[PDB]
Amino acid sequence: AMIPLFKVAVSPTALDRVAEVFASGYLGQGPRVAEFESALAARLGNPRVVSVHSGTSGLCLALRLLDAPEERDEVLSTPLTFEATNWAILADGRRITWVDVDPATLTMDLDDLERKISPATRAIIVVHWTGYPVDLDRLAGILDRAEREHGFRPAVIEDCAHAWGASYRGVPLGSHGNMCVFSFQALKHLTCGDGGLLTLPGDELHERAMLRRFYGIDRTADRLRGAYDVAEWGLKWHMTDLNAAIGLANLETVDEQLRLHRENAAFYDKELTGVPGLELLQRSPDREGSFYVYDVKVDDRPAFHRKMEAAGIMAGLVSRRNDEHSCVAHLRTSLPGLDSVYDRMVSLPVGWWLTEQDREHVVATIRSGW
Amino acid sequence: AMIPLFKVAVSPTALDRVAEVFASGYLGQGPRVAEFESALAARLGNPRVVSVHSGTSGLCLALRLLDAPEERDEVLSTPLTFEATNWAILADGRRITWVDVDPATLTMDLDDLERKISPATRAIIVVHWTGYPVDLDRLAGILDRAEREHGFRPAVIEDCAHAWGASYRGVPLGSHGNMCVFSFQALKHLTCGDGGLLTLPGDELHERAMLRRFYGIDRTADRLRGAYDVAEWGLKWHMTDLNAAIGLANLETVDEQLRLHRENAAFYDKELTGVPGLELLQRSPDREGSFYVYDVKVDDRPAFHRKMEAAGIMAGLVSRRNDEHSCVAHLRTSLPGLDSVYDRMVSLPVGWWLTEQDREHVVATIRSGW
């Protein structure tokens, strides 16, 4: 019985909701999308939420919403993320400038970020990697100083794909003044099969997002009579009712599943300290992460991997560090923080599908040495 | 109740197929996608088919696959199409050069096309508008001459969104040597809810398409150990099993529905002759269209619209001509062919949902004058 690192959480009520969509004969973007958006807005405490096709499409739309001259061609991003984060930048026609990783958190090194903001910086994408939030107040201070130095304030987009339900300093992600993109892909906490959510900090961005997620076409307009105008183009970035229905079905139990992710993480916190050759990540008590996976850093990782495999525990990387891909060989730079942890890091199963017996087995296996 | 211009065709067997996907617990791109691709390949007679998220994503992927220098920044396209065709060009970072419309067919004016091919021409997107195929052999000859003149041969991408099941000179669309993009959006002939198909004329393009439709990530690789390399980036352009299951269910009856589209069109051809103020489009016998809608051209169209509305018949435009949108005001050009028909054209319901009584009602209403 292999314990997986990721698992789909699809409610046995999803079929009932999909049946409703098929029976209605309306499969497009309609009342279920509206219902799902309303439900998400209430949970988030941000009314400005825009459902989208995927987290990836949400990131593409967020970048498209930026108003800055083309000469501002740089987007700052870390390579320790899923490729979507960074390929969205390339698809937006911009150049990636890599920011290092803080070895203590495995999220963006904000000292390195501050050093790399330049007059060419149009945006910064920050990833709440594996569900652990970035220090958003510190980030805001960095931007305050950058604005005072350069005369403009680079936009921040928060990639929240791993961080449904997370909060920082008593405020849910989505409400810290930056655009945020959540993912409802099959393996994420809340799934629509595929889907995402772009949240906006203000009305102008909200209104532009609603338009540009469907070609810039106002869907309330009389399209049969050509009585609409596309002010700004967009693509097919919206969510439809088929996927909103699945999301609605999965909302019922996502909180309990999050609670289990967090309970399991707390168990590992307690039981994996004092293991020679294993280092835990120290998480700050001023925020609440979502633990998409549970990261540790180990000595002799090849032996650790063999140990996990033999014990039927799936353990490893979420992705290859993106700066190593040959498609971006021309963008390589020195990232010593990431270098110092990349051969040590390993993600462990921590999700709702872990029985007490499962999580005990993970801990017992690790404690028997490798 | 009103006779609609478009209607969703979703089989009562779709729920059974979706239940299968949910029961498998695998919602990603997997065995149903493979099954659907195999079925489509057999129908098309082209083994090189790549399922994608939507027709729009198929067009975006096709444009990314092009090999041409940045100074070839021009894509030739007509504005008489759905906005996706042209917004894909803008999202690709290119410049649209509008091509006029042949008033006799409402598809691209190929004389105007040949005049507008230039040293900057990167590609040509041709749209089989409302289901009627473009003269692809003539197009190939134009490109032969362009290649002689410039040394490069601009690529053609065929937008087949309206033309599932269409053929030209005895050969199914998808097999004329150009990349083709089909749409399986809800209102299209064959629907997956959302989905599309990119077909390729050669193996190299096929292999690149299969990689780039999912971030450039080889899905057979060991991602847990970071044992993969992205040679060329992509986005989340693929189709997943939820939508492939719906497409599989809808394959059963799409042929009969197509037969009805064609039968209804033939009925209109026969019964709408000699109507004062109404001009039919003359279609060539060397090809077989799919009649997404049935186009005519009328005098005093505002009165014609009021007549249709009062009779409970939905009639009008599929889209506003795209060159009128303010987002492309800088690209306006004189298109006298399109100008000569744009205030006259009207699309009529012609699909499988038309009863004999419905189509007789359409004909009787039109023949009674306006």
XYZ file of C-alpha atoms in Angstrom:
740
model
C 0.000 0.000 0.000
C 1.930 3.001 -1.330
C 1.357 6.251 0.551
C 1.103 8.930 -2.129
C 2.560 12.429 -1.953
C -0.522 13.869 -3.685
C -4.113 12.657 -3.999
C -7.323 13.880 -5.624
C -10.100 14.926 -3.236
C -13.316 14.564 -5.219
C -16.552 14.362 -3.291
C -19.043 11.590 -3.955
C -21.462 14.517 -4.377
C -19.649 15.833 -7.457
C -21.552 13.465 -9.761
C -24.862 14.901 -8.511
C -23.684 18.455 -9.303
C -22.386 17.507 -12.771
C -25.720 15.788 -13.463
C -27.395 19.121 -12.689
C -25.177 20.912 -15.216
C -25.912 18.348 -17.956
C -29.644 18.383 -17.188
C -29.712 22.196 -17.425
C -28.201 22.019 -20.906
C -25.980 24.960 -20.043
C -22.346 23.919 -19.914
C -20.798 27.349 -20.329
C -19.948 30.089 -17.870
C -23.207 30.714 -16.014
C -25.075 30.306 -12.737
C -22.785 27.675 -11.200
C -19.745 29.879 -11.784
C -21.649 32.724 -10.120
C -22.604 30.484 -7.186
C -19.032 29.228 -6.773
C -17.573 32.757 -6.936
C -20.052 33.957 -4.296
C -19.113 31.075 -1.998
C -15.400 31.718 -2.449
C -15.800 35.480 -1.919
C -17.510 34.811 1.403
C -14.776 32.431 2.564
C -12.006 34.804 1.496
C -13.541 38.058 2.717
C -12.655 39.566 -0.655
C -15.614 40.243 -2.981
C -13.328 40.830 -5.958
C -12.773 37.271 -7.110
C -12.666 36.022 -10.668
C -12.879 32.328 -11.509
C -10.526 31.142 -14.236
C -9.628 28.010 -16.203
C -6.602 27.127 -14.101
C -4.027 28.678 -11.814
C -1.862 28.968 -14.912
C -4.523 30.978 -16.763
C -4.977 33.110 -13.643
C -1.265 33.969 -13.674
C -1.408 34.766 -17.400
C -4.401 37.038 -16.847
C -2.766 38.736 -13.850
C 0.326 39.533 -15.940
C -1.854 40.783 -18.802
C -3.561 43.225 -16.410
C -0.303 45.038 -15.709
C 0.039 48.512 -17.104
C 3.707 49.318 -17.498
C 5.769 50.265 -20.547
C 7.313 47.433 -22.563
C 10.761 48.713 -21.608
C 9.969 47.426 -18.131
C 10.561 43.885 -19.320
C 11.730 42.095 -16.191
C 9.707 39.843 -13.892
C 11.390 38.687 -10.681
C 10.656 35.092 -9.691
C 12.274 32.138 -7.940
C 12.994 28.859 -9.758
C 11.823 26.716 -6.813
C 8.247 26.448 -8.006
C 6.069 24.574 -10.451
C 6.971 25.465 -14.050
C 3.631 27.226 -14.655
C 4.738 30.160 -12.488
C 7.657 30.924 -14.718
C 6.383 29.798 -18.090
C 3.525 32.283 -17.680
C 6.201 35.009 -17.593
C 7.778 33.766 -20.829
C 4.361 33.520 -22.497
C 3.728 37.127 -21.432
C 6.817 38.058 -23.458
C 8.928 39.128 -20.493
C 12.348 38.157 -19.207
C 12.754 36.228 -15.962
C 15.320 37.443 -13.458
C 15.833 34.673 -10.917
C 15.632 35.406 -7.222
C 17.300 33.077 -4.725
C 15.613 30.888 -2.125
C 15.864 31.321 1.660
C 17.243 27.983 2.942
C 15.259 28.372 6.185
C 11.843 28.618 4.510
C 12.284 27.346 0.935
C 10.479 30.475 -0.216
C 11.866 33.534 -2.016
C 14.882 35.180 -0.379
C 13.591 38.694 0.217
C 17.081 40.138 0.766
C 17.988 38.914 -2.699
C 14.703 40.282 -4.040
C 15.497 43.749 -2.718
C 18.955 43.640 -4.334
C 17.507 42.665 -7.710
C 14.645 45.129 -8.137
C 15.684 47.466 -10.963
C 14.186 50.130 -13.235
C 13.286 47.257 -15.584
C 11.177 45.444 -12.992
C 7.522 45.296 -14.066
C 6.419 42.643 -11.564
C 7.396 40.190 -8.839
C 5.716 36.803 -8.570
C 5.920 35.413 -5.040
C 5.053 31.768 -4.453
C 3.669 30.564 -1.114
C 5.597 27.385 -1.766
C 4.138 24.096 -0.431
C 1.519 26.196 1.354
C 3.745 28.348 3.584
C 3.105 32.082 3.246
C 5.732 34.620 2.246
C 6.401 37.481 4.692
C 4.008 39.837 2.923
C 4.503 42.827 5.242
C 8.259 42.679 4.717
C 7.661 42.461 0.977
C 5.470 45.573 1.169
C 8.277 47.456 2.948
C 10.735 46.429 0.243
C 8.344 47.830 -2.347
C 7.938 51.046 -0.342
C 11.695 51.598 -0.530
C 11.869 50.570 -4.199
C 9.110 53.021 -5.057
C 10.988 55.790 -3.246
C 14.180 54.918 -5.152
C 12.906 54.213 -8.659
C 9.705 56.253 -8.781
C 7.399 53.318 -9.473
C 6.072 50.393 -7.478
C 6.463 46.965 -9.119
C 3.278 44.887 -9.032
C 3.223 41.763 -6.898
C 1.339 38.647 -7.952
C 0.986 35.963 -5.271
C 0.991 32.388 -6.550
C -1.287 30.696 -4.008
C -1.653 27.336 -5.807
C -0.429 25.421 -2.731
C -2.055 27.677 -0.200
C -5.837 27.432 -0.305
C -7.073 28.350 3.192
C -3.770 29.891 4.294
C -3.499 33.135 6.241
C -0.819 35.605 7.259
C -0.905 37.799 10.365
C -4.583 37.162 10.932
C -5.659 37.940 7.376
C -6.541 35.335 4.745
C -4.425 35.186 1.613
C -6.208 37.268 -1.012
C -6.580 40.279 1.276
C -3.091 41.775 1.560
C -3.342 44.234 -1.336
C -1.803 42.083 -4.092
C -3.370 40.094 -6.873
C -3.554 36.437 -5.849
C -3.978 33.288 -7.925
C -5.405 30.127 -6.412
C -5.373 26.739 -8.172
C -8.186 24.196 -8.168
C -6.258 21.604 -10.176
C -7.038 17.937 -9.345
C -4.291 17.507 -6.726
C -4.809 20.850 -4.940
C -6.746 21.206 -1.716
C -9.926 22.437 -3.361
C -10.415 20.982 -6.824
C -12.715 21.704 -9.748
C -10.913 19.085 -11.797
C -9.237 22.106 -13.273
C -9.880 25.665 -12.231
C -8.455 28.675 -10.475
C -9.294 31.982 -8.863
C -7.781 35.412 -9.440
C -8.404 37.831 -6.581
C -8.017 41.585 -7.026
C -7.220 44.380 -4.563
C -9.327 47.033 -6.341
C -12.337 47.695 -8.579
C -10.551 48.713 -11.754
C -8.512 45.498 -11.859
C -11.604 43.468 -10.957
C -13.628 44.915 -13.830
C -10.794 44.451 -16.345
C -10.232 40.870 -15.121
C -13.882 39.929 -15.626
C -13.763 41.225 -19.180
C -10.350 39.927 -20.235
C -10.917 36.394 -18.884
C -13.308 35.898 -21.844
C -11.694 37.662 -24.809
C -12.542 41.123 -23.486
C -16.182 40.420 -24.351
C -18.900 41.713 -22.020
C -21.053 38.597 -21.775
C -24.160 40.641 -20.909
C -23.956 42.482 -24.246
C -26.047 41.764 -27.350
C -23.520 39.722 -29.308
C -26.121 38.668 -31.890
C -26.324 42.303 -32.995
C -22.580 42.933 -32.686
C -23.353 45.453 -29.953
C -20.180 45.076 -27.922
C -16.645 46.433 -28.022
C -13.442 44.721 -26.946
C -11.409 47.479 -25.287
C -8.579 45.100 -24.353
C -8.137 41.621 -25.773
C -8.108 38.453 -23.709
C -8.128 34.710 -24.302
C -10.341 31.861 -23.075
C -9.204 32.157 -19.486
C -12.564 31.729 -17.751
C -14.091 28.843 -15.800
C -17.307 27.157 -16.934
C -20.209 25.647 -14.995
C -19.015 22.047 -15.374
C -15.940 22.790 -13.310
C -17.671 25.233 -10.965
C -20.142 22.462 -10.098
C -17.286 20.153 -9.103
C -15.749 22.919 -6.996
C -19.080 23.527 -5.254
C -19.293 19.843 -4.383
C -15.797 19.844 -2.960
C -16.296 22.931 -0.785
C -18.254 20.964 1.802
C -15.262 19.070 3.160
C -12.215 21.117 2.194
C -12.004 22.672 5.682
C -11.861 19.267 7.381
C -9.245 18.141 4.889
C -7.165 21.263 5.649
C -7.492 20.534 9.336
C -6.035 17.071 8.697
C -3.130 18.446 6.620
C -2.330 20.752 9.520
C -2.778 18.047 12.199
C -0.456 15.748 10.285
C 2.118 18.527 9.927
C 1.923 19.185 13.664
C 2.484 15.455 14.260
C 5.628 15.491 12.080
C 6.813 18.680 13.824
C 6.589 16.852 17.134
C 7.909 13.471 16.124
C 10.642 14.258 13.603
C 12.744 16.528 15.792
C 15.984 15.079 17.102
C 16.513 12.756 14.138
C 20.187 12.840 13.113
C 20.627 13.884 9.498
C 17.159 15.414 9.271
C 16.461 19.134 9.539
C 12.960 20.593 9.846
C 11.921 23.925 8.383
C 11.181 26.451 11.130
C 7.781 28.012 10.491
C 6.743 31.350 11.983
C 3.795 31.441 14.390
C 2.435 34.645 12.822
C 0.865 32.793 9.892
C -0.992 29.590 9.062
C 0.157 27.485 6.115
C -1.727 24.782 4.228
C 0.918 22.046 3.944
C 0.380 20.863 0.389
C 3.367 18.652 1.216
C 5.676 18.544 4.241
C 9.289 19.496 3.518
C 12.412 18.366 5.315
C 16.124 18.539 4.521
C 18.213 15.381 4.886
C 21.789 14.125 4.765
C 22.473 11.206 2.410
C 19.259 11.846 0.490
C 19.810 8.989 -1.984
C 19.698 6.517 0.921
C 16.702 8.370 2.345
C 14.874 7.997 -0.978
C 15.642 4.268 -1.120
C 14.379 3.932 2.448
C 11.108 5.702 1.660
C 10.548 3.701 -1.530
C 11.151 0.367 0.196
C 8.651 1.376 2.883
C 6.026 2.292 0.290
C 6.246 6.010 0.977
C 6.224 8.413 -1.949
C 8.781 11.152 -1.272
C 10.659 13.603 -3.455
C 10.432 16.824 -5.438
C 7.344 18.680 -6.560
C 9.356 19.968 -9.557
C 12.870 20.313 -10.926
C 14.332 23.741 -10.108
C 13.158 25.685 -13.142
C 16.446 27.493 -13.807
C 18.028 24.192 -14.887
C 15.727 23.696 -17.890
C 17.462 24.045 -21.228
C 14.758 26.427 -22.502
C 16.062 29.029 -20.033
C 19.810 28.320 -20.214
C 20.348 31.957 -21.269
C 18.880 33.188 -17.959
C 21.092 31.263 -15.517
C 22.541 33.112 -12.526
C 24.205 32.234 -9.227
C 21.653 31.106 -6.606
C 23.704 29.928 -3.624
C 20.772 29.718 -1.207
C 18.938 27.316 -3.478
C 22.181 25.455 -4.197
C 22.681 24.900 -0.459
C 19.376 23.057 -0.032
C 18.377 21.635 -3.416
C 20.195 18.305 -2.948
C 18.867 17.944 0.593
C 15.188 18.823 0.298
C 12.504 16.161 0.197
C 8.720 16.495 0.328
C 6.781 14.013 2.480
C 3.090 12.982 2.332
C 1.069 15.003 4.824
C -2.457 15.190 3.361
C -5.946 14.166 4.502
C -5.568 10.640 3.084
C -2.995 9.718 5.745
C -4.456 7.441 8.408
C -2.951 7.609 11.898
C -1.293 4.302 10.997
C 0.093 5.856 7.807
C 1.686 8.869 9.473
C 3.084 6.707 12.271
C 4.619 4.478 9.582
C 6.285 7.495 7.945
C 7.757 8.609 11.273
C 8.787 5.080 12.337
C 10.503 4.496 9.000
C 12.497 7.726 9.287
C 13.375 7.002 12.923
C 14.793 3.577 12.019
C 17.545 5.370 10.087
C 18.737 5.221 6.481
C -40.325 29.103 -27.473
C -37.584 30.577 -29.639
C -35.726 28.586 -32.272
C -32.074 29.062 -31.230
C -29.141 29.768 -33.548
C -26.878 27.503 -31.457
C -27.589 24.608 -29.084
C -25.541 22.232 -26.945
C -25.470 18.592 -28.060
C -24.663 16.551 -24.949
C -25.470 12.846 -24.954
C -27.464 11.218 -22.172
C -24.472 8.848 -22.035
C -22.066 11.614 -20.958
C -23.000 11.238 -17.288
C -22.031 7.541 -17.458
C -18.613 8.472 -18.862
C -18.021 11.211 -16.287
C -18.955 8.773 -13.509
C -16.226 6.473 -14.872
C -13.662 9.283 -14.585
C -14.685 10.148 -11.035
C -14.719 6.475 -9.997
C -11.191 5.985 -11.381
C -9.956 8.822 -9.192
C -7.850 10.048 -12.090
C -9.043 13.426 -13.359
C -5.905 14.422 -15.256
C -4.688 13.767 -18.771
C -4.729 9.978 -19.000
C -6.467 6.983 -20.583
C -9.658 8.761 -21.662
C -7.619 11.391 -23.505
C -5.695 8.581 -25.216
C -8.962 6.819 -26.128
C -10.488 10.018 -27.506
C -7.379 10.891 -29.532
C -7.329 7.388 -31.048
C -11.000 7.650 -32.010
C -10.502 11.079 -33.580
C -7.363 9.982 -35.457
C -9.296 7.105 -37.015
C -12.149 9.377 -38.086
C -9.795 12.011 -39.482
C -7.308 9.691 -41.180
C -4.514 11.734 -39.600
C -2.603 9.905 -36.853
C -0.939 13.112 -35.653
C -3.642 14.586 -33.443
C -3.155 16.420 -30.174
C -6.057 17.086 -27.814
C -6.038 20.506 -26.197
C -8.027 22.590 -23.690
C -9.961 24.539 -26.316
C -9.780 25.656 -29.913
C -8.270 28.856 -28.561
C -5.468 26.965 -26.823
C -4.961 24.932 -30.003
C -4.455 28.144 -31.990
C -2.048 29.512 -29.358
C -0.036 26.301 -29.446
C 0.014 26.236 -33.265
C 1.413 29.786 -33.341
C 4.073 28.926 -30.756
C 5.206 25.989 -32.911
C 6.126 28.296 -35.798
C 9.756 28.736 -36.741
C 10.266 32.268 -38.019
C 12.455 35.268 -37.093
C 10.950 38.006 -34.916
C 11.143 40.496 -37.794
C 8.505 38.385 -39.539
C 5.894 39.815 -37.202
C 2.820 39.753 -39.409
C 0.006 37.213 -39.311
C -2.581 37.553 -42.077
C -6.152 36.956 -40.935
C -9.684 38.088 -41.770
C -11.803 39.972 -39.222
C -14.945 37.985 -40.065
C -14.411 35.321 -37.435
C -14.800 34.668 -33.728
C -12.468 36.863 -31.670
C -10.367 33.890 -30.510
C -8.830 33.546 -33.982
C -7.364 37.004 -33.855
C -6.736 37.464 -30.164
C -4.504 34.365 -30.282
C -2.328 36.346 -32.719
C -2.076 39.320 -30.356
C -1.313 37.042 -27.380
C 1.482 35.494 -29.470
C 3.073 38.963 -29.652
C 2.419 39.455 -33.374
C 0.764 42.066 -35.566
C -2.499 41.342 -37.422
C -2.730 42.373 -41.069
C -6.378 42.179 -42.064
C -7.394 40.338 -45.217
C -10.680 41.133 -46.937
C -13.658 38.825 -47.310
C -15.048 37.348 -50.542
C -18.674 38.585 -50.659
C -19.709 35.412 -52.509
C -18.511 33.013 -49.789
C -17.984 35.086 -46.619
C -14.552 33.499 -46.301
C -11.105 35.024 -46.849
C -10.560 36.815 -50.170
C -7.570 34.907 -51.540
C -6.812 37.589 -54.157
C -6.414 40.060 -51.307
C -4.370 37.498 -49.388
C -1.869 37.133 -52.204
C -1.502 40.923 -52.511
C -0.777 41.247 -48.787
C 1.884 38.577 -48.314
C 5.072 40.520 -47.602
C 8.627 40.061 -46.302
C 7.088 40.457 -42.818
C 4.563 37.628 -43.194
C 4.973 35.022 -40.513
C 1.824 32.968 -41.031
C -1.712 32.963 -42.358
C -4.727 31.822 -40.343
C -7.573 30.723 -42.594
C -11.031 30.213 -41.124
C -13.524 27.737 -42.575
C -16.187 30.217 -41.544
C -19.626 28.838 -40.525
C -18.393 25.419 -41.669
C -17.592 26.152 -45.318
C -14.092 25.221 -46.428
C -11.554 27.598 -47.921
C -10.095 26.759 -51.347
C -7.027 25.034 -49.881
C -5.439 24.050 -53.218
C -5.540 27.656 -54.395
C -4.056 28.728 -51.085
C -1.203 26.214 -51.541
C -0.462 27.684 -54.992
C -0.322 31.181 -53.529
C 2.225 29.930 -51.001
C 4.219 28.195 -53.743
C 4.611 31.566 -55.456
C 5.360 33.340 -52.170
C 8.110 30.827 -51.392
C 9.634 31.401 -54.830
C 9.635 35.152 -54.203
C 10.785 35.320 -50.564
C 12.543 31.995 -49.969
C 10.454 31.360 -46.874
C 7.035 29.768 -47.032
C 4.540 31.252 -44.569
C 2.781 28.625 -42.488
C -0.965 28.174 -42.728
C -3.044 27.384 -39.663
C -6.620 26.304 -40.428
C -9.253 27.357 -37.898
C -11.741 24.506 -38.169
C -13.883 25.425 -35.152
C -17.077 25.524 -37.258
C -16.091 22.684 -39.520
C -16.006 19.386 -37.672
C -16.677 16.665 -40.249
C -16.034 18.942 -43.244
C -14.041 17.892 -46.299
C -12.486 19.526 -49.338
C -11.899 17.837 -52.679
C -12.470 14.395 -51.242
C -10.079 14.831 -48.327
C -11.156 15.449 -44.716
C -10.059 18.680 -43.101
C -6.897 17.893 -41.155
C -5.225 16.170 -44.116
C -4.292 18.982 -46.506
C -0.761 19.583 -45.219
C -1.513 22.420 -42.772
C -1.898 22.502 -39.027
C -5.603 22.434 -38.182
C -7.439 23.375 -35.013
C -10.843 21.931 -34.196
C -13.070 23.178 -31.363
C -15.158 21.045 -29.019
C -16.669 24.005 -27.177
C -20.239 23.489 -25.883
C -22.023 24.911 -28.931
C -19.821 23.201 -31.543
C -20.824 20.080 -33.435
C -18.769 17.735 -31.267
C -18.454 18.924 -27.687
C -16.308 18.000 -24.695
C -17.831 20.843 -22.721
C -14.607 22.532 -23.625
C -11.846 21.041 -25.708
C -10.093 21.117 -29.029
C -7.806 19.217 -31.345
C -4.602 20.319 -33.030
C -3.689 18.184 -36.025
C -0.186 18.217 -37.497
C 1.085 17.508 -41.015
C 4.383 16.001 -39.840
C 6.049 14.029 -37.057
C 8.370 16.738 -35.733
C 5.505 19.176 -35.158
C 3.511 16.349 -33.603
C 6.209 15.522 -31.062
C 6.773 19.198 -30.159
C 3.025 19.745 -29.791
C 2.659 16.806 -27.413
C 5.372 18.248 -25.190
C 4.461 21.927 -25.312
C 0.763 21.384 -24.615
C 1.775 20.540 -21.018
C 4.533 23.009 -20.126
C 7.126 21.201 -22.237
C 7.130 18.449 -19.601
C 7.460 14.841 -20.767
C 4.686 13.240 -18.727
C 6.394 9.838 -18.853
C 9.438 11.208 -16.993
C 10.281 10.783 -13.295
C 9.152 14.194 -12.040
C 9.573 13.168 -8.392
C 13.335 12.956 -8.964
C 13.473 16.049 -11.187
C 14.560 13.778 -14.038
C 13.192 15.787 -16.938
C 14.195 18.746 -19.069
C 11.974 21.368 -20.638
C 13.514 22.083 -24.058
C 10.768 24.518 -25.089
C 8.263 26.011 -22.653
C 4.495 25.635 -22.913
C 1.428 26.427 -20.837
C -1.502 24.315 -19.614
C -2.888 23.788 -23.081
C -3.831 20.115 -22.773
C -7.166 18.329 -22.401
C -7.898 16.162 -19.347
C -9.933 12.974 -18.937
C -13.109 14.684 -17.655
C -13.556 16.467 -20.961
C -12.282 13.585 -23.088
C -14.980 11.391 -21.487
C -17.673 13.850 -22.556
C -16.270 13.975 -26.091
C -16.249 10.167 -26.254
C -19.915 10.096 -25.272
C -20.803 12.668 -27.899
C -18.992 10.891 -30.741
C -21.821 8.373 -30.999
C -24.336 10.729 -32.566
C -22.298 13.566 -34.035
C -22.518 12.026 -37.534
C -26.327 11.992 -37.478
C -26.385 15.545 -36.177
C -24.080 16.608 -39.029
C -26.395 14.879 -41.496
C -29.288 16.972 -40.143
C -27.308 20.243 -40.376
C -26.637 19.409 -44.013
C -30.204 18.287 -44.742
C -31.597 21.520 -43.278
C -29.138 23.607 -45.316
C -30.210 21.763 -48.462
C -33.826 22.504 -47.543
C -33.084 26.227 -47.240
C -31.145 26.119 -50.540
C -34.263 24.726 -52.218
C -36.952 26.765 -50.491
C -35.381 30.231 -50.141
C -34.834 30.979 -53.855
C -36.517 33.929 -55.534
C -37.131 35.823 -52.300
C -37.175 39.596 -52.809
C -34.399 41.211 -50.801
C -32.672 37.915 -49.942
C -29.489 36.600 -51.546
C -28.174 33.077 -50.980
C -24.504 32.114 -50.824
C -23.440 29.889 -53.736
C -21.375 26.940 -52.458
C -18.991 24.875 -54.589
C -19.732 21.180 -55.237
C -16.069 20.192 -54.747
C -16.308 20.307 -50.950
C -18.641 19.474 -48.092
C -19.285 22.035 -45.368
C -20.704 21.524 -41.902
C -23.203 24.409 -41.661
C -22.613 25.569 -38.108
C -25.156 28.239 -39.105
C -26.833 29.095 -42.433
C -25.862 32.493 -43.856
C -27.885 34.732 -46.162
C -27.638 38.385 -47.184
C -30.685 40.658 -46.907
C -31.904 44.140 -47.812
C -33.445 46.215 -44.985
C -31.867 43.973 -42.369
C -33.203 45.930 -39.378
C -36.743 45.111 -40.532
C -35.634 41.518 -41.228
C -34.325 41.200 -37.662
C -37.609 42.536 -36.252
C -39.478 39.977 -38.380
C -37.376 37.063 -37.112
C -37.670 38.219 -33.489
C -41.474 38.497 -33.738
C -41.589 34.969 -35.175
C -39.429 33.544 -32.390
C -36.464 32.873 -34.675
C -32.978 33.699 -33.411
C -31.016 35.282 -36.251
C -27.970 37.528 -36.423
C -24.203 37.650 -36.198
C -21.875 35.030 -34.772
C -19.506 37.879 -33.843
C -18.851 41.556 -34.486
C -16.268 41.999 -37.264
C -13.070 41.968 -35.191
C -11.404 44.929 -36.910
C -13.996 47.271 -35.357
C -12.912 46.568 -31.756
C -11.174 49.457 -30.066
C -8.300 47.195 -28.924
C -7.201 46.984 -32.583
C -8.034 50.530 -33.686
C -4.376 50.942 -34.708
C -4.699 48.108 -37.249
C -7.676 49.372 -39.250
C -7.529 48.997 -43.005
C -9.957 49.362 -45.896
C -11.896 46.151 -46.529
C -14.428 47.026 -49.245
C -15.448 43.389 -49.812
C -16.466 42.943 -46.193
C -18.024 46.433 -46.178
C -20.267 45.410 -49.095
C -21.846 42.537 -47.141
C -21.444 43.296 -43.429
C -24.687 45.294 -43.143
C -26.551 42.590 -45.062
C -25.364 39.308 -43.611
C -27.513 37.302 -41.209
C -27.042 33.773 -39.808
C -30.074 31.472 -39.562
C -30.656 28.408 -37.365
C -29.864 25.248 -39.308
C -28.818 22.660 -36.721
C -30.004 19.201 -35.628
C -32.503 20.649 -33.129
C -34.675 21.963 -35.949
C -37.872 19.941 -36.372
C -39.484 19.814 -39.801
C -42.082 22.227 -38.422
C -39.342 24.594 -37.184
C -37.563 24.899 -40.549
C -40.863 25.241 -42.407
C -41.657 28.076 -40.005
C -38.331 29.784 -40.798
C -38.958 29.532 -44.549
C -42.606 30.619 -44.342
C -41.676 33.611 -42.197
C -38.930 34.775 -44.564
C -41.043 34.246 -47.690
C -43.870 36.353 -46.235
C -41.609 39.417 -46.452
C -40.453 42.127 -44.050
